[PDB]
Amino acid sequence: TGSTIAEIRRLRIEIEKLQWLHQQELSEMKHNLELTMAEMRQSLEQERDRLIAEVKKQLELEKQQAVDETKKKQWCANCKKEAIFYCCWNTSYCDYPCQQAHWPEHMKSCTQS
Amino acid sequence: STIAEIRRLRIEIEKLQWLHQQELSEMKHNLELTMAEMRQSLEQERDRLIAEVKKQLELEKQQAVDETKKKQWCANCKKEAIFYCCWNTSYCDYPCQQAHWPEHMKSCTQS
Ligand SMILES: [Zn+2]
Ligand SMILES: [Zn+2]
Ligand SMILES: [Zn+2]
Ligand SMILES: [Zn+2]
Numbered sequence: 001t002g003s004t005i006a007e008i009r010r011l012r013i014e015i016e017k018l019q020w021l022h023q024q025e026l027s028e029m030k031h032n033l034e035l036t037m038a039e040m041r042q043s044l045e046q047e048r049d050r051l052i053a054e055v056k057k058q059l060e061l062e063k064q065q066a067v068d069e070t071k072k073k074q075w076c077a078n079c080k081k082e083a084i085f086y087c088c089w090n091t092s093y094c095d096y097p098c099q100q101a102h103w104p105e106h107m108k109s110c111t112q113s
Numbered sequence: 114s115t116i117a118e119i120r121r122l123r124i125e126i127e128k129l130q131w132l133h134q135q136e137l138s139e140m141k142h143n144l145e146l147t148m149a150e151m152r153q154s155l156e157q158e159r160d161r162l163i164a165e166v167k168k169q170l171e172l173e174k175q176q177a178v179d180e181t182k183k184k185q186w187c188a189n190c191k192k193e194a195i196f197y198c199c200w201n202t203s204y205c206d207y208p209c210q211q212a213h214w215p216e217h218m219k220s221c222t223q224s
Contacts, residue, residue: 007119014123018130025137037148044152048159055163059170067177071186074201080182089197090185 078102088112189213199223 076083076094078101083092085099088111093099099106185194187205189212194203196210199222204210 004115004119007116011119011123011126014126018126022133033144040148040152044155051159052163052166055167056170059167059174063170063174063177066174067181068191070178070181071191072201075182080179086200090183 077106188217 074083074086074092075081076098077087077091078093078098081094081098083094085093085096087093087099087106091106091110093102185197185203186192187194187209188198188202189204189209192205192209194205196204196206198204198210198217202217202221204213
């Protein structure tokens with residue numbers, strides 16, 4: 001009695017403090033974690049939508065390059081490999097076996113005359 | 114010793130508190146381990162999606178290449194060509210032909 005009731009009071013004080021603190025962690029975390037789990041779900045999709053377009057633009061670039069490089073070359077009317085023999089307008093061949101194969105089909109169109 | 118029992122009760126309470134905080138920070142850590150796993154499996158599916166769209170677009174690339182091989186193209190402006198000059202050299206019209214002549218002159222193999 002005296003010292004004992006004084007230190008009981010100290011234990012009551014300490015326990016009451018721990019309750020206040022835990023009431024603050026609990027009141028704050030239900031809200032704070034609500035905002036952290038949607039903040040990271042959105043930053044992921046903003047990064048993904050910037051990625052799909054990054055590659056669409058890239059391939060659209062590579063396409064136009066490939067198409068333009070194709071404009072600078074003659075191509076075999078038979079097999080679409082690059083050609084080196086000329087027959088008539090818009091008709092070339094990689095070699096005479098392609099020309100000789102294509103000839104039944106090409107004869108109806110050949111303008112070499 | 115009543116006094117001693119109380120102060121011990123105090124130390125055992127504060128030790129329970131450290132266990133408390135350590136339980137929290139271990140859940141804090143398991144939330145992050147599951148969190149970072151999320152972006153990983155999501156990025157994995159995202160990259161498998163990207164793969165299929167690359168596949169589609171390379172198919173279109175090859176289709177445009179193949180269509181381009183079936184036509185003559187202006188050596189000057191890459192519009193479709195109409196007038197023939199010589200091997201691999203064709204023009205959409207006389208302006209292009211003559212605009213190109215200063216350079217093409219040395220390569221013209223006109224027969
Ligand atoms: Zn061929
Ligand atoms: Zn022909
Ligand atoms: Zn032109
Ligand atoms: Zn020429």
